[PDB]
């Protein structure tokens, strides 16, 4: 994996050593180049992970996720030079440094072979995200959000720490390979249940799971645009990635100790999507939508079913691409009107003709319209859950009904309708905004042709 | 501010006939029943006592509510009509034209130059029109939403740009 | 009752300005002005061809515009589809499956030249 980590690390001096106004260009072009090298790993061998060394390994689970992060890196960079341009050279240089330190930790996390090495970088993503949210966040409540974000995931991660070290002293090794081959049946002793709770709660908090989900509406609403997407597009998936990886030793205790989470998730999706049916703030609307889609993956993972797992990873990446995109949609309109309220800016299709389209198939992809991989993800989970229980469809099917009503609702209120009379500062959309939207839509629909590169190891 | 008794009963008259359109349909039936409505409205002119008039219209509104047509004939270019706000997704406001591009701007030089003429006139008329507004403003804030007209010569009436330069009802 | 003197004067100037404003919304004869566009050999050919405008000039005009539509929208698309269906996708088993050729008692079949027997003696009823 050093063909990716090393250029990413060497890009850190690259930005700092750059000139005054060339930082955006060099960082963008090389990050895009880093993305291209990441695509070299999409080929996964028959039934073996592409084990490179003891330090780093990759399989069909992290292969799509890794290139999603590298592909993301230009997109935050392409979404940041609007509000950041009115700042000193150092602070802009610092901002780029953080995201690159962010992706570097993310790249190391997905490729880590050892659960402890997984663990260290998995919490380490807090440090750059926390400062990004707090420093450049354009709001007042962000100060409370940083505390809410940091403690909430840490409050679950710290009990996780004691779980891994216990496994190391008891079972022996702790890497992703030996655990799978030396997996032993977990008993029903009450101590095993608490270890199950410790080994699981840390991952559910970052998903999030309904109830333990209040840190998204705080963080996402007033996070900076660049930090908003990564936290929405991968950092939620980071909690997801550990769910497949760590549920190799928690069998068969998963069958009995999952009912509270399934009930919390299968009911939370209806409740959280019911949140989305009415939101005064567009960004809050998108953040809660991420809760519902992620709650689908929690159901997907907890069943622990072949079909369920492939649907989980397919939805996991697909949601990240569209959720990041919709956040870019919010940033554009919020930039023109300098506010976040729904009804303030309306009838924007007439004023901006192309953005009417960009927000349109963004909503369709959010709607899991077939064959968009959002559908191939959600539909797989329904089939797996229905096999698990025939009444799952009543709830999870009703989600697609509720998901439709709010998804178009933001399309109806903002894009369609009559133009706002007093608003007159909306200029023609710059080609940067239009291009950035295409950098999200095109890979999504392009990847629809070959879902086998997103269906994960269980494919 | 206050729809007086005469204003309300005329409003009752206008709405009553419009509903009776949907009922009578055919014109010959219309001209008869409208005349009864007219004749039976003329009879209570010497009612004198205003209290009776409220009682005379008390049963009238509910009687209209009794015989109101569930599908009244509402006019297409009106609220509730089929062609209501339909021809609106094309009337982009005037101020959007300022954000045009010079290549686009050079396409229509004469109109753009004349628009600049209207642009300057609004700039010159603003100070006079805002000054005129406050010089005869009523005490304790504006009491009536009606705005003063242009009193002297040359000066344009205050708050005119959006009314005058409103998009046409048939922009296409 | 009845625009008030100030109000009727207000609507008068409002009407006057509105009329003049909509008058500016007219178009001069020169507008719209536009830079020229790279001409095409076929287009200019049909312009000089159609100067006569005779009825027999129009049919070949319409026939040709129907002809090049057929070749570039049916002839080529049916070519690549047939080639795909004849040498790429049918080269895999069970890709194009069709209902069995429905034969009837009495006729004959091709691949062996055998005759399915004639329908035997009917109970011979009539209406």
């Amino acid at each position: 994996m050093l063909k990716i980590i090393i250029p990413t690390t060497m890009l850190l001096p690259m930005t700092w050593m750059s000139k005054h106004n060339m930082i955006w260009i060099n960082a963008t072009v090389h990050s895009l180049l880093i993305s291209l090298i990441s695509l070299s790993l999409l080929n996964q061998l028959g039934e073996n992970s592409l084990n490179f060394s003891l330090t780093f390994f990759s399989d069909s689970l992290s292969a799509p996720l890794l290139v999603l992060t590298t592909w993301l890196l230009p997109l935050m960079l392409m979404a940041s030079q609007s509000h950041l341009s009115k700042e000193t050279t150092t602070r802009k240089k610092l901002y780029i440094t953080m995201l690159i330190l962010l992706q570097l930790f993310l790249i190391m996390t997905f490729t880590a072979t050892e659960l402890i090495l997984f663990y260290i970088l998995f919490e380490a993503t807090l440090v750059p995200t926390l400062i990004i949210i707090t420093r450049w966040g354009n709001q007042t409540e962000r100060l409370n959000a940083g505390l809410y974000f940091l403690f909430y995931t840490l409050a679950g991660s710290l009990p996780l720490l004691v779980a891994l070290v216990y496994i190391q002293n008891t079972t022996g090794s702790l890497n992703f390979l030996i655990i799978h081959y030396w997996s032993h049946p977990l008993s029903n002793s009450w101590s095993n249940i608490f270890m199950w709770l410790a080994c699981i709660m840390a991952f559910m908090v970052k998903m999030p799971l309904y109830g333990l989900h209040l840190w998204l509406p705080k963080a996402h609403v007033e996070a900076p645009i660049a930090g908003s997407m990564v936290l929405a597009a991968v950092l939620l998936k980071l909690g997801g990635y550990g769910m497949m990886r760590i549920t190799t030793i928690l069998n068969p205790l998963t069958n009995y100790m999952a009912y509270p989470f399934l009930m919390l998730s299968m009911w939370g999706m209806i409740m959280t999507s019911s949140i989305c049916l009415r939101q005064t703030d567009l960004k809050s609307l998108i953040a809660y939508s991420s809760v519902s889609h992620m709650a689908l993956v929690i159901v997907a993972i907890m069943i622990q079913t072949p079909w369920s797992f492939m649907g989980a990873t397919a939805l996991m990446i697909a949601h990240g691409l569209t959720s990041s995109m919709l956040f870019c949609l919010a940033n554009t309109n919020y930039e023109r009107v300098h506010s976040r309220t729904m009804i303030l800016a309306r009838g924007l299709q007439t004023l901006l003709p192309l953005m009417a389209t960009w927000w349109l198939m963004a909503s369709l992809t959010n709607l899991a319209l077939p064959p968009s991989i959002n559908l191939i993800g959600e539909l797989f989970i329904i089939t797996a859950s229905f096999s698990w229980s025939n009444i799952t469809i009543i709830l999870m099917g009703m989600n697609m009904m509720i998901t439709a009503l709010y998804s178009l609702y933001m399309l109806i209120t903002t894009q369609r309708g009559k133009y706002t009379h007093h608003i007159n500062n909306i200029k023609a959309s710059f080609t940067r905004e239009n291009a950035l939207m295409a950098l999200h839509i095109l890979p999504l629909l392009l990847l629809t042709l070959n879902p086998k590169m997103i269906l994960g190891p269980l494919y | 501010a206050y729809l007086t008794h005469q204003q309300k009963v005329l409003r009752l008259y206008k709405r009553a006939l419009r509903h009776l359109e949907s009922w009578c349909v055919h014109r010959d039936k219309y001209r008869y029943f409208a005349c009864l409505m007219r004749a039976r409205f003329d009879e209570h002119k010497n009612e004198k006592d205003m209290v009776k008039a409220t009682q005379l219209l008390r049963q009238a509104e509910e009687e209209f509510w009794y015989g109101q047509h569930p599908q009244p004939y509402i006019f297409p270019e009106s609220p509730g009509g089929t062609s209501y706000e339909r021809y609106e997704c094309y009337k982009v406001p005037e101020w959007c034209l300022d954000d045009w591009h010079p290549s686009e701007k050079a396409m229509y030089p004469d109109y753009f130059a004349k628009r600049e003429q209207w642009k300057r006139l609004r700039r010159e008329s603003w100070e006079r029109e805002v000054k005129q507004l406050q010089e005869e403003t009523p005490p304790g804030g504006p009491r009536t939403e009606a705005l003063p007209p242009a009193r002297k010569e040359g000066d344009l009436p205050p708050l005119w740009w959006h009314i005058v330069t409103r998009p046409r009802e048939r922009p296409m | 009752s009845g625009y008030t003197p100030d109000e009727k004067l207000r609507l008068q100037q409002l009407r006057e300005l509105r009329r003049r404003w909509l008058k500016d919304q007219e178009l001069s004869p020169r507008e719209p002005v536009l830079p020229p566009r790279r001409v095409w050999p076929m287009e200019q050919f049909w312009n000089k061809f159609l100067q006569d405008g005779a009825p027999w000039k129009n049919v070949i005009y319409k026939t040709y515009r129907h002809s090049i539509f057929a070749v570039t929208h049916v002839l080529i698309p049916v070519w690549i589809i047939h080639y795909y269906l004849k040498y790429h996708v049918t080269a895999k088993p069970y890709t194009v499956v069709e209902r069995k050729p429905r034969i009837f008692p009495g006729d004959t079949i091709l691949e062996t030249g055998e005759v399915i027997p004639l329908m035997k003696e009917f109970p011979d009823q009539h209406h």
């Binding site: 023609a428 | 982009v92 959007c96 954000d99 686009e104 | 500016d24 919304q25 178009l27």
Partner: peptide, 12 residues
Amino acid sequence: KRLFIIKPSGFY
């Protein structure tokens, strides 16, 4: 009679 039509700039 032809008359001006307002349209948001699509050149960008």
